[PDB]
């Protein structure tokens, strides 16, 4: 979930 | 709900998917709404149990007494099935006090035959004591206890007499002061 | 859809955070819990309610004595 949140924040 | 949470964790750890988690969250929300709607009948059940706590504790007091009788003698034993049948017969044959009254008379009329004369007197006297405990006041209880004591040759003393006294205590006092002990 | 899923799982995230916080307390008390569970499993099949309570108090104080 944290990795998905980081990917959403980066994009 | 617990199975849904476990399945959501397993499916999230198993790697379309976003729609699946959305469906699981919607199902959980629907379950929570169903519980919130179903939580609207608790006060009625609370009122009923608070009303019937008196008869419940009286019944368990009777059953504890009968277990004590069964512990005294091998013949006087008792199971729960006979008591349940008696309680069912009560309903087959100011409301809660009326069912409590019917319960006491039916339990006495059912378990008198299971005892001899001395235990018949024991049982009748102690149901009388319990009913006058629950219904009557503290002075009534003290007078009954001290009159049982002067019947027991242990605590000798006159009972508490009030001006507006009930006739039953006067009659029993006259019976015991005349030394008509069996009466 | 991914953004909505992320925003809609705040309760799950805080529940997971609470479980990870309480994992230390559950791992600290795992051995004692297993001890007392086996004690119920092998010592309390033939005891009454008040006897069970008294023996439970004795077991709890004696288990807390040994830290």
Name its key features.
0% strand, 3 chains, mainly alpha, part of a larger assembly, motor protein, 11 residues, elongated
Descriptive report:
This is part of a larger assembly, with 3 copies of chain A. Chain A is an all-alpha fold. Chain A is built from 1 helix and no strands. Chain A has one helix spanning 2-10. Chain A is elongated.
Query: Largest interface, per-chain counts?
Result: B-C, 5 and 6 residues
Q: Assembly state here?
A: part of a larger assembly
Largest sheet of chain A: none
Radius of gyration of chain A: 5 Å
Order of helices and strands of chain A: H
> So what's the overall shape of chain A?
elongated
Helix coverage percent of residues of chain A?
over 70%
From the N-terminal CA to the C-terminal CA of chain A, the straight-line distance is 15 Å
Number of helices of chain A: 1
Overall strand count of chain A: 0
Name the structural class of chain A.
Answer: mainly alpha
Strand composition percent of chain A: under 5%
PDB class: motor protein
Keywords: Enzyme, AAA protein, motor protein
Entry title: CryoEM structures of yeast cytoplasmic dynein in the presence of ATP and Lis1.
Chains A, B, C: Dynein heavy chain, cytoplasmic
